[PDB]
């Protein structure tokens, strides 16, 4: 069920994709885990369409962006998937951690805190996003506590 | 001196037992440096291409690696618009992996290996290393068109 997002991301941006995000609504857990289990190159042009469709200028792209990542961080850890698609997926999380507003990245970093406390971190490729978000937090010098203050408490919670 | 004793086995060994898809002869223009032909790796966009390389042997060779460029234009992540190669065994330790346990053939094999398998973690061309990764067919299209204008005949 991927090929009705590839004919949407080819024509225009945020006129037919944004309407597909609110019409599907059912779950992006069965639309990635099984769509990689058939063809891994179908789990990398789907994310290069979902992220193009869900820009951070509106709220029904940012909670889509905040839902697609928490499941995409969970599946690279949980699953025992091929090492050419973990390099592809972590090569889309890195290429898209640049233009985030404040209070979503501290919550994603809290998910990362939760992963480091207990959760079975079978691969350290999930912690590859922890560098770039601590950069992108620091560059936003505005009260979301400013960027650097949130970063220092974040590093304190990582360390402790 | 040592240059002569290596090059002697190597020139002779590249006329008698060169690696598959590969040849290397003492250049007819340049009777000091070596001309290689690496024939485009199977199931890569370089299929139907004959890629000429100049292998410059340094003076203190075999204490220094060979110095190789793609003289046939090549559309590739680890090869730029002037034929410069991102290769570990083209540099010395610790940045590189040349040592005397190797020879011109083992590296020219590692070159046909890199033509088939570009490394996206040593990009000379970020446009091609990205295209290779994120739009494989556009890289493979452009590299195959590349192979039809420059590596063809």
From TrEMBL, chain A:
Full-sequence portion shown in this chain: 1 to 166 of 1328
Protein name (database record): Fanconi anemia, complementation group I
Domain called FANCI solenoid 1 cap: residue spans: 1-53
């Amino acid at each position: 069920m991927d090929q009705k997002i590839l004919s949407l991301a080819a024509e225009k941006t945020a006129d037919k994709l944004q309407e597909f995000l609110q019409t599907l609504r059912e779950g992006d857990l069965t639309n990635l885990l099984q769509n990689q289990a058939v063809k891994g190159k179908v789990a990398g042009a789907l994310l290069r369409a979902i992220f193009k469709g869900s820009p951070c200028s509106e709220e029904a792209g940012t909670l889509r962006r905040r839902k697609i990542y928490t499941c995409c961080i969970q599946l690279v850890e949980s699953g025992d998937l091929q090492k050419e698609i973990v390099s592809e997926i972590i090569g889309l999380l890195m290429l898209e951690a640049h233009h985030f507003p404040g209070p979503l990245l501290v919550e994603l970093a809290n998910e990362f805190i939760s992963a480091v406390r207990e959760g079975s971190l079978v691969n350290g490729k999930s912690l590859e996003l922890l560098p770039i978000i601590l950069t992108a937090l620091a560059t936003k010098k505005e009260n979301l506590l400013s960027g650097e203050e949130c970063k220092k408490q974040l590093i304190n919670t990582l360390c402790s | 001196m040592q240059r002569a004793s290596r090059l002697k086995r190597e020139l002779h060994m590249l006329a008698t037992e060169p690696p598959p898809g590969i040849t290397c002869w003492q250049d007819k223009d340049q009777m000091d440096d070596l001309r290689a032909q690496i024939l485009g790796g199977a199931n890569t966009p370089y299929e139907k291409g004959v890629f000429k390389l100049e292998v410059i042997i340094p003076e203190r060779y075999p204490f220094e690696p060979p110095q190789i460029r793609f003289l046939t234009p090549i559309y590739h992540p680890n090869i730029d618009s002037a034929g410069r190669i991102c290769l570990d065994v083209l540099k010395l330790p610790p940045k590189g992996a040349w040592r005397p346990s190797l020879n011109i053939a083992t590296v020219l094999t590692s070159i046909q290996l890199l033509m088939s398998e570009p490394n996206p973690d040593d990009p000379l061309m970020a446009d091609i290393s990205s295209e290779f990764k994120y739009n494989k067919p556009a890289f493979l299209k452009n590299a195959r068109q590349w192979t039809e204008k420059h590596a063809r005949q």
